[PDB]
Structure formats: C-alpha cells, structure tokens
Amino acid sequence: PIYDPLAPSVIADPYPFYRKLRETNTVHWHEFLDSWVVTGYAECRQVLGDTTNFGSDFRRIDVEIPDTQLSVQSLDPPEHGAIRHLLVSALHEQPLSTVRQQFAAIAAQHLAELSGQPGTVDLVSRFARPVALRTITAFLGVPPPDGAGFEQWSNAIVRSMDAGIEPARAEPGNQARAELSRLVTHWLAEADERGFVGAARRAAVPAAVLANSLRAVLHAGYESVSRLLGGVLARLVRHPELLAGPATRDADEALVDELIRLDGPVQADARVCVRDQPVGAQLVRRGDVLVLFIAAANRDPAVFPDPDAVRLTRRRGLHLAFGRGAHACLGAGLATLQLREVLGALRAGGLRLAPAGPAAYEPTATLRGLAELPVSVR
C-alpha cells in the first residue's frame, strides 16, 4: 500500500501523505481496500454532487440492507428527500436567537471553569467534548447524558468507521449504535415540544428511518463539533495571533471559513458507483466504492494556494468540509454559528492557553480527533 492510514506517523499528521497521493493521482486505485481514493478538489466536488451516478444507498448496487437500518445518511433520492426535508424543517423551526444564546453561554461557562487552573489541563476532555455534548443536547432539547459514558459509546462508533482497515472495529460500533438507539427512543417518547426532537416528532416516514436519523443527528452533531473544536483549539494554542485579528463579524467569517477548511474533522466520505462514470480522467464502474478524501481536497493547491495556511482573502464557498449536494451537512449553519461563539468567548475570556506538551491524535482515520490537548492557563 501507499501508506497505512492507521499508522502512528500518518495519524500524527496525515496531510503530507494526502499531498503525496494527490501529486501522484487525484483518483488512485487502492487495491487492498478495494476502493478509489479521491484527493483532488474537482473530483471530490464532482462525486459529492452527483447522486445519480454515485450513491450512499448500497441497495442501488444490489446489496441487501434491512429496512430497520435505513437512515438519512444511507438513503438517496427520492427516498432521501422525505426524511431530509423533515429534519431541515425541524431545524428551521428553532429560533436562532435562542440557539445563539445557548451556544454562547455553554462556551463561556466551560471556558470560565478553566480560569484559575494552575496546572496542565486537557482541552479535549475539559472543553471540546463537554461543550459539544451540551451544545447538541441543548439543540435537541433533551437532558445531557453522562459525558464520560457517552464519549465511550460514541467513540466506539467513530472507530468503527475504520472497520474496512481493521475489521475488529466493526462489532463494538454495532453495540454502541444500539445503545444510542435506545437513548434516542427514550427521547422520542419523552422529549419536550421545545427543541429539535419535539419538532422532528411533529413533522413525522418510517419510524425506523426517523429514529436512526435522529441518532445520526446526535452522533454526527456531537462528534463533528467535538473534533472540530479540538483541531481548531490545537491551531489556536500554537498560533494565538489568529485571535488577534479585527474580530468583527465579517473578519471572523473569513477566519471561521479557514479554520473549518483546515481543521474540519471529516477525512473520508464514501460513495458507491451506481452507473459507470468518469471522475477526473478515470472511469469508475458500477459497483466500485470511492472514498472521497475531502480534507485532502481542502488542501488542493490548485484551489487553495499555500493550502496549509490560514489566508483571510480566499473566495468563500469553496471548501468541502461540510460536503456538497444532497447530503450536505444539515448542521453546517449551526456549526459555523457555534464556532463563531467559541472564538468570541475566547476573546472575552482574556485567558492565554499555552501548550503544555504535544497535541496527541487518536488512531481514527475517517474522523480526525485529538486524544489530548494539554495546556497551561494564564
């Protein structure tokens, strides 16, 4: 193989490896994984937006998928539209003034808990994860579960996304998916009318699709926000000058766009080819699996010159960290609002967060995440 996606040196910093792949071929056949690896921006953008020839529902290539496992992320048009519009409608019903107030208060509270800490603190377990958990459960309108236990179940699902590389990772993910399903079932039965769960219940599609899709909102919301915050904090702690900018709404728009482009946690996004189709110069055939390395696409220098740097003058609307097309991230607006509020809380907190040891990364290849981010607080 080109490299081991779970090798420690790759996990420590995968972007040079992505770049070597991209420089050799933006659409490369990985024979041991039996998949195309797509690292070019143009090709990833093409595949994401074409659900006619590239799908997320493996039933379209004659794979058996029981009805009880269907979900918004594994359905394609036309079945995808009903549950997708249901979720968007429930999202759009949430008043943004309240959402922003909740997100800002959570971020400020967890930062204030850090003030007065004289030793080394781990920003993953002390900020990124608890903020994400309270953020997603406030949005859902449900009581937060225990943070440590919830992180353990959720982590099993994240690791299972790499089961094609390490098959032993599949089984813990399935047990964990079942646990999160029971959690979601309890919320469906008991949640207040305030919040996203109450709105989704009102809008309601097969009950299995709704429950699995809400589980997806919970897990995707928690893990994506948690891991984005960890990566962004890692960059801010090494480059505090990023927070020393104008700090106006528009200046922070550009900064947030760059932070999501660079530190968006989704490294890989898979599709199946339903009908033979060229991708770049290559012919992809019905039945082929494609892994879109969207974090690599977000460092493609043909689109992002000096790709590894924060540059505040790039054209907006280019990065693929939220996907593109029918399956584009449901929470992209919530996530940008949330990160804006974190930046604002950091600036108002007046706290200096200096490195107290290296950023340490977890052996997760699909969804990048820090295992630990040790800092001193001054």
Which residues are part of a known binding site?
A: 80, 84, 271, 327, 329
Q: Are 223 and 128 in contact (CB under 8 A)?
A: no
DSSP string over 283-299: EE-TT-EEEE-HHHHTT
Residue 168 or 309: the one with the smaller Cβ distance to Na ion is: 168
Q: Are 3 and 363 in contact (CB under 8 A)?
A: no
Residue 168 or 189: the one with the smaller Cβ distance to Na ion is: 168
Residue 73 or 125: the one with the smaller Cβ distance to ligand HEM is: 73
Span interacting with ligand HEM, options 34-42, 148-156, 234-242, 263-271, rule CB under 6 A: 263-271
Q: Is 279 in the site for ligand HEM (CB under 6 A)?
A: no
Q: Are 273 and 284 in contact (CB under 8 A)?
A: yes
DSSP string over 119-134: SEEEHIIIIIHHHHHH
Q: Is 228 in the site for ligand HEM (CB under 6 A)?
A: yes
Q: How many CB atoms lie within 10 A of CB 180?
A: 23
Q: How many CB atoms lie within 10 A of CB 93?
A: 14
Handedness of CA 61, 67, 73, 78 (dihedral sign): positive
Binding-site positions for heme b read 80, 84, 271, 327, 329
Instruction: Using DSSP, state whether 229 is helix, strand or coil.
Output: helix
Span interacting with Na ion, options 81-89, 160-168, 253-261, 348-356, rule CB under 5 A: 160-168
Characterise 43 by phi-psi region: left (phi > 0), alpha (psi -120 to 50), beta (else).
Answer: alpha
Smallest distance from Na ion to CB 168, Å: 5
Q: Is 129 in the site for ligand HEM (CB under 6 A)?
A: no
Residue 24 or 101: the one with the smaller Cβ distance to ligand HEM is: 101
Q: Is 84 in the site for ligand HEM (CB under 6 A)?
A: yes
Span interacting with ligand HEM, options 34-42, 309-317, 325-333, 354-362, rule CB under 6 A: 325-333
Q: Is 210 in the site for ligand HEM (CB under 6 A)?
A: no
> What span, in angstroms and rounded, lies between the C-alpha atoms of 113 and 42?
44
Give me 177's structure tokens: 């998916």
Smallest distance from Na ion to CB 167, Å: 10
Q: Are 209 and 217 in contact (CB under 8 A)?
A: no
Span interacting with ligand HEM, options 28-36, 200-208, 233-241, 320-328, rule CB under 6 A: 320-328
Characterise 287 by phi-psi region: left (phi > 0), alpha (psi -120 to 50), beta (else).
Answer: left
Q: Is 260 in the site for ligand HEM (CB under 6 A)?
A: yes
The contact set with Na ion (CB under 5 A) reads 168
The contact set with ligand HEM (CB under 6 A) reads 48, 56, 72-73, 84, 136, 216-217, 220-221, 224-225, 228, 260, 264-266, 269, 321-323, 327, 329-331, 334-335
